[PDB]
Amino acid sequence: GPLSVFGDRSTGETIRSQNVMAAASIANIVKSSLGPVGLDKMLVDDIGDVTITNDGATILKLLEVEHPAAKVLCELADLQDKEVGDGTTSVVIIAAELLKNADELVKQKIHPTSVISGYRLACKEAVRYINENLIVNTDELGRDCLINAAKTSMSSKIIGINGDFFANMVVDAVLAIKYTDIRGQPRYPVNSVNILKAHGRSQMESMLISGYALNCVVGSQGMPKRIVNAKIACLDFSLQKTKMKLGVQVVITDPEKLDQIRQRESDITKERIQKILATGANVILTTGGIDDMCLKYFVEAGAMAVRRVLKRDLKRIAKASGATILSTLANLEGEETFEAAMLGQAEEVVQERICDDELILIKNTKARTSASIILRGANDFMCDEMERSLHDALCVVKRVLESKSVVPGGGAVEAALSIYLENYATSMGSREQLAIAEFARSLLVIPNTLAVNAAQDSTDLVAKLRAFHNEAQVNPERKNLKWIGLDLSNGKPRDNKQAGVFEPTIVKVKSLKFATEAAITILRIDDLIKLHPESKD
């Protein structure tokens, strides 16, 4: 008679209501952490680890979910960090409100394929409207565009100060790592900025180290911890005792040749350590291991030897200081040459006091003038929040300097798209105008969430917000009301052009493309079959 599947089968509008409540279970969590009036949360593990954060990526990654429609929105926040770098809170609220308004359409006996086809006419038109109504590129504003875009990202986090202390440390970090590529590509690799945490003084004592800040120790306490005019020798091979391989063994037939082999295991080792040190190298970085016998040759010669450093940290030092990452001996059948003209350079390599730890700093590196940021907080919970907030701020200045285009934030984009898509559905709307009209109401939840978290007027401030954007589209008398946003400190519509609330273009372009594509997949779960877990059989 019925299906003989050993699991569970639920069809009809039951799963069509369960997927919306699964998406609203995620959106109602992160709705209290959006905008400058957003508040952080607590992520307590079963073992007791506390993670205080407010970014939409760290919350949904550590939180475990069970529903299959909930895993789509949790992986949607993970893609926003890779593609853009912030947005993991705004994409999750839009994609869940896209399913909430489409649930109201499919309960009116409207087919969901018209909602999918209606959302594509609204998503492609919203990207087309935001690319023809941008304010200005990065030539008229200059350096004021990079500071105002950085302060917009920090307003939802712990580093949202009224001054320009944290804003200037992010702009000067991305501007110091400008690495040009082939075919005219001025790329800005934000992963090269070493973000370090240390529970020390207040947030106003966060150092901006022009150079690199290595998170390692010297080791033996007989080496000079400060070397001025240093020559960095970046190498990756373990300076240890010379051990033979698996295919090589020592089989001796005469006891007189015993001590000559035992001394050869250290004489070959000390042969490499004398030809990489007599060429003027003072700082030696090693990703392998330097044992206690090899530490004697640096204390006697007065050189700094750092051992067991990261492979990702050695590449950022050797590229910024002009050093060559050497692994072994080379250069056309030479015994030990080392290519001494390929040594790095540094102005000063100084191990400073970082509140009961050891931290090695390199000053300006003499080749590329890189930068590293040492963050300072009150405890480990603030320093983990300061690291995630700084990484979201580095991604804003990366996309603005690469793609010289900004849009006004604070609900100014969503207010103009809410009125343009209603008039877009009036002309060419026969059976899909109801899906384009609900795409405009789903976009209105971004200024609606800012009114709830600020404890301001909800249905009056956003109604006054769309009153300015309606006059900028039906009365072409150069009103320039396209940059009207929200002033959550006063509760009135402000002009984001003069106030300096700037966001990148692809933080709203890729947000509307990812939320529309995620809403299509969850809209096609009209039938759902859940099998029993095959653990005990």
């Binding site: 893609l79 890779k82 593609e83 082939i182 033979m244 391989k245 295919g247 090589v248 063994q249 020592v250 089989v251 001796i252 037939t253 005469d254 040749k257 000559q260 082999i261 050869r264 070959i268 001996l329 056309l332 059948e333 015994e335 493309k513 990812f514 594509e517």
Partner: protein, 98 residues
């Protein structure tokens, strides 16, 4: 076409990568590999000549059990320096090919 009535779909590889939208799909007629490049200091070469090598560029070893007998002071120098000269003859044989 107009020569055969069969088509093998195993000659059409499909690479699944997470990121972007469905409009970012590509129909590149060449080879797409998911492996990483070691070392990744270059990652671009024009007018490239690609060669598939099934030989292992490492220390010499045979299918039979092979051991090295070291019973002299200078015999340890003849192990490491001859292994460097072996693979140097393999790289220079590759480099002189072009």
């Amino acid at each position: 076409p107009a020569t055969a009535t069969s088509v093998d779909l195993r000659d059409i590889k499909i690479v699944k990568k997470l990121g972007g939208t469905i409009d970012d799909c590509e129909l590149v007629e060449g080879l797409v590999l998911t492996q990483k490049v070691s070392n990744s200091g270059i990652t671009r070469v024009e007018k490239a000549k690609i060669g598939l090598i099934q030989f292992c560029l490492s220390a010499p070893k045979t299918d039979m059990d092979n051991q090295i007998v070291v019973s002299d002071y200078a015999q340890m120098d003849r192990v490491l320096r001859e292994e460097r000269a072996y693979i140097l003859n393999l790289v220079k044989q590759i480099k002189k090919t072009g």
